Amino acid sequence: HVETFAFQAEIAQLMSLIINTFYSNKEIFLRELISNSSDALDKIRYESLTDPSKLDSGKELHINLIPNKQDRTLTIVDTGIGMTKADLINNLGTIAKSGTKAFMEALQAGADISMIGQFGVGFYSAYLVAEKVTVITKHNDDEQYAWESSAGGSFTVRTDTGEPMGRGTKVILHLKEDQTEYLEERRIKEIVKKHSQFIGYPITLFVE
Numbered sequence: 001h002v003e004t005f006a007f008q009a010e011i012a013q014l015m016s017l018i019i020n021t022f023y024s025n026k027e028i029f030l031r032e033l034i035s036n037s038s039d040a041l042d043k044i045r046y047e048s049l050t051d052p053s054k055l056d057s058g059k060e061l062h063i064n065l066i067p068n069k070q071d072r073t074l075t076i077v078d079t080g081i082g083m084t085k086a087d088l089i090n091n092l093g094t095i096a097k098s099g100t101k102a103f104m105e106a107l108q109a110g111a112d113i114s115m116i117g118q119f120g121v122g123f124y125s126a127y128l129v130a131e132k133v134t135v136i137t138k139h140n141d142d143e144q145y146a147w148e149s150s151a152g153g154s155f156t157v158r159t160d161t162g163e164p165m166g167r168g169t170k171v172i173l174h175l176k177e178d179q180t181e182y183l184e185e186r187r188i189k190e191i192v193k194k195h196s197q198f199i200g201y202p203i204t205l206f207v208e
């Protein structure tokens, strides 16, 4: 069944900032997730170096960007370490909760949002483009989970029953009505080339 959680009020508060503040340079939302995905392919390249039985859930280490116009969705799939329940529910909430304050202190004093990454809170970047985000993730030690939040204070998590994804994180952006420009191949290739040309993992932009 579906469990409902509340955001730590600092996370809540953040998500509003992102959602309601005027900021036109939204495309950066994507290199944050690319980057994030690289950070989770790093973690598992590394661990498998000592324990190669960790790759039994999938030898192949790659990023996939998937645009779906009919759904209004860009998913960023990745074969990374993945997230456990304790991750989704309590461990991420914890780290995120410092990243948030620093990021927000650093805001008057005129840093800005394209910098949310140097603060550990990149993932929340999605909220620039996404009206609801759905994380489908699969760790080696735990069950497969779906996390979802349309923001506004609360997130859900359930055990998934979709395609068994083997090991990874899929992040399905359910884009707002006026942001469909990131559903366009020509527009996705330009951001990748601009902001993520050095990611040491195969990035595959699916066409439609």
Ligand SMILES: COC(=O)c1c(C)n[nH]c1-c1ccno1
Binding pocket: 088, 092, 093, 096, 120, 121, 122, 123, 124, 135, 147, 169, 171
């Ligand atoms: C994949 O989505 C996430 O990365 C996530 C979740 C599910 N909770 N918190 C976070 C997070 C990201 C960055 N800092 O925190």
Ligand SMILES: COC(=O)Cc1cc(O)cc(O)c1
Binding pocket: 032, 033, 036, 037, 039, 040, 078, 080, 082, 123, 168, 169, 171
């Ligand atoms: C830094 O920790 C995290 O944010 C987990 C995470 C893993 C991933 O494969 C993609 C993400 O967007 C986030």
